[PDB]
Structures are given as structure tokens and as C-alpha cells.
Paper text:
Multi-log improvements in affinity for ESs were the result of improved off-rates or combined improvements in on- and off-rates, with a small number of enhanced contacts to antigen observed in the crystal structures.
Five GEPs (1, 2, 3, 7 and 8) bind T117 with nearly identical behavior, including GEP 1 and GEP 7, which differ only by alternate J segment utilization, showing that the two incorporated mutations did not affect binding, so no further IGHJ1*01 GEPs were produced for study.
Numbering used by the authors:
A (entry chain L): 0 to 27, 27A, 28 to 109
B (entry chain H): 3 to 25, 33 to 52, 52A, 53 to 82, 82A, 82B, 82C, 83 to 96, ...
Amino acid sequence: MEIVLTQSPGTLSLSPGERATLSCRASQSVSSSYLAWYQQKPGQAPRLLIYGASSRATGIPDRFSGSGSGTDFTLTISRLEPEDFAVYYCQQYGSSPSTFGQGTKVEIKRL
Amino acid sequence: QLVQSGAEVKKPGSSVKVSCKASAISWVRQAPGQGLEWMGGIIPIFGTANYAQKFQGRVTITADKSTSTAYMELSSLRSEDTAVYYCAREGGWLGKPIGAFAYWGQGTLVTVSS
């Protein structure tokens, strides 16, 4: 049975400088915290941010972090830069077949 | 370095074939309002295709080892197959187990239009 990943919220509306915390819930425990996070901006391929739940990819800024184990995982951006408004996906590779969440859009909050 | 074939516009029920030139990948699509989904991939060591149940029976994933090129052929196209299709690779490996996708192609837009 495929592990189903469900992200929350669907859309996060915040201003630059604010903290963002994104959630990914798994239908089943994710082995060995084998959970990754990606960023995707329009017209571009996804970019790996975090793997093994909490390990930052090389060249990824300090303001990105990940945490969690079992079924509950989070990606936090400590202070939002303009370039951080994008869609974010989680992915598990603790079981075959690999599965992805549906994405959370982080968008600029209304004025 | 993963370089994919150009965008395609297809009719309903037809098939599309996308290529990805590496200079054992997976195919992942971004379909509007459905996030990312893993379709299948060429697996390490055996170099044969595995598939997601959702697409089993109308996706065919092959690799030409000599030209380092992978293909995905998706048949009986439906409006919901409109999506950007990516090839992606994780990266002998004797380090810790890591199944995240570090490397991505530029994507191939397939539009299924009536």
C-alpha cells in the first residue's frame, strides 16, 4: 500500500520577514525518517531542500530547516525572503513506490 | 545533467513519448491541482522498469544504455494527464541510503487538448 502524504495548509499567506511552517502528514510511518522537501518556482524543476527529514542539501540557506519522524514532518522557513514565495512538496522514499505530497503554496499576504 | 525532449500537444486517447538524455532515472509529473506524482523509474543494478499502480498498463519506461537515454511512453491520454513531466535521478554507492531526487531535467509540458 502506497504511503499517502498530505500537506497542510494548501496555501500559506504571509508577508516577507515572517516565519513559515509547513506540515506533511504520512498515512503510515516513514521508515528511517526518509523524508525529503522540495521547492518549485514557476517554469522551473523542483529543487531539493532537505533530505532525511532534517538534513539540509548543500547550498541551501540556513533559514530552511526540517523536522519530524513517524508520520508528522515539518519544513520551516525562519524568515521569508521574497525569493521564497513558491510551492513546496514533501516526498517519502522509505517505501516503494516513492510518493509526494500535493504541495503547499506560500504566497504573499494581501496588503 | 538531464536534458528532456520538447513540449507536446496531444489528442485524447493518443500516446506520447518523452525522452531524457543524461550527460536509472525516475519519471515524476506535476499535474495541475494534483501536486507531484511518481510514475515509474529504471531501477539500479537490474536497469529495468518499475511502475506506480496508478499508471501500470499504460505507461512504458525504457532506457537505451548505449545512449544514456531514458524514455517514458504514456498511452490513452486523458485531460487529467496534462502536466509537466520530469525525469529525475537520486545519486558504486557505499554511503548512507538516500532516495531523494537531487537532479532534475528541465521538464516536458504535455498538453492533452480536445
